[PDB]
């Protein structure tokens, strides 16, 4: 009860802290700086300093798929669905689908009156990858959202729950991380999610305590790649006595 | 596709899981068994018989 | 020595000597050509 309110007021104070001082972090008193900041580096420039994308990939990146060229794969798949007529059920046919292994809980939803639809996926849309999607905050909602909390995503005929990661939308090679979704400009939320070919609409919903869904952000799917990289910045302080 | 008539057959009633038959008009393109079927509330599956 | 305390055990052979010379205040000092290719 009150511990959720205290954590929410801590979220509000973090918004005040991270906006005036952008990414400033105090020096740890007891922990050695070489241990806490071991996997860190400094760059001379913020726009033109090179960075290896293949460097230091954790165990999570071994569970997802990769594309040698996403643009050519998207063009190849879209060409063969417009040109080739695969031998199957044609449009306008009243067909019936025998689907293999579904729970019975699908059926009682239909008996209650909830509409049930289905759609055949394209090739390589069932596999896992990293989604990049552009969002913009609804003016009608004012509650701030943090970087790594659970949110409900409606992304191209699909609904799923995941925690995003907000980064600045910039034409540069690397994007600075944004901790809180500012309600004036477009940001990018990166989600471990199934592959969905663009264009596809993106809606974000925050689950209220009383079961309500409040619309937060709207936009589209930008690209499907894990090569996009997010950089978190740290400012240390020192006094020239 | 939109489900017009839905009926169920359970493979095992204690397993609560079985084959589902959904009937509706094909809408977008040519629907084929060689790609998966996604129900919007229940994830990916496989059809077997059309 | 200015940094730490040196524990010295006074043997009977150190009678005429001072105490400062058994705690040394300094550390010893401890101290690839071009060939043209074209």
């Amino acid at each position: 009860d009150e511990e959720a309110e205290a954590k929410m007021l801590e979220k509000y104070k973090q918004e005040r802290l991270e906006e005036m001082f952008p990414d400033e972090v105090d020096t740890p008193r007891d922990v050695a700086a070489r241990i806490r900041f071991q996997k860190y580096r400094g760059l001379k420039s913020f726009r033109t300093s090179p960075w290896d994308p293949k460097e230091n990939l954790p165990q999570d990146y071994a569970r997802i798929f990769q594309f040698q060229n996403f643009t050519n794969t998207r063009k190849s798949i879209f060409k063969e669905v417009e040109e080739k007529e695969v031998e199957g059920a044609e449009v306008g046919w009243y067909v019936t689908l025998h689907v293999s292994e579904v729970p019975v809980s699908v059926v009682e939803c239909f008996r209650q009156g909830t509409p049930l639809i289905a759609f055949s996926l394209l090739p390589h849309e069932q596999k896992m990858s990293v989604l990049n999607m552009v969002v913009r905050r609804d003016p009608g909602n004012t509650e701030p959202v943090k970087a790594k909390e659970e949110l409900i995503f409606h992304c191209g005929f699909r609904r799923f729950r995941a925690s995003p990661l907000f980064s600045q939308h910039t034409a540069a090679d690397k994007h600075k991380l944004q901790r809180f979704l500012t309600a004036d400009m477009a940001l990018v939320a990166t989600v471990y999610a199934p592959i969905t070919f663009p264009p596809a609409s993106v809606l974000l919903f925050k689950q209220k305590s009383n079961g309500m869904h409040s619309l937060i952000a709207t936009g589209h799917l930008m690209s499907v790649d894990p090569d996009r990289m997010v950089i978190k910045r740290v400012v240390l302080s020192g006094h020239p006595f | 596709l939109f489900a017009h008539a839905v009926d169920f057959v359970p493979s095992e009633e204690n397993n609560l899981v079985g084959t589902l038959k959904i009937s509706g008009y094909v809408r977008g393109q040519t629907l084929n068994v060689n790609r998966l079927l996604h129900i919007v509330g229940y994830g990916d599956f496989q059809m077997k018989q059309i | 020595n200015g940094k730490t305390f040196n524990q010295v055990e006074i043997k009977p052979e150190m009678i005429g000597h001072y105490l400062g010379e058994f705690s040394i205040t300094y550390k010893p000092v401890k101290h690839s050509r071009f060939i043209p290719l074209k």
């Binding site: - | 068994v33 998966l36 | 305390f5 040196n6 040394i24």
Partner: peptide, 22 residues
């Protein structure tokens, strides 16, 4: 027919001497 593989199927110093004089 494609499968439902969203995840990859493949898995000599004395006792009283200080460290300075050592």
């Amino acid at each position: 027919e494609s499968l439902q593989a969203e995840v990859i199927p493949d898995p000599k110093v004395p006792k009283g001497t200080s460290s300075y004089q050592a």
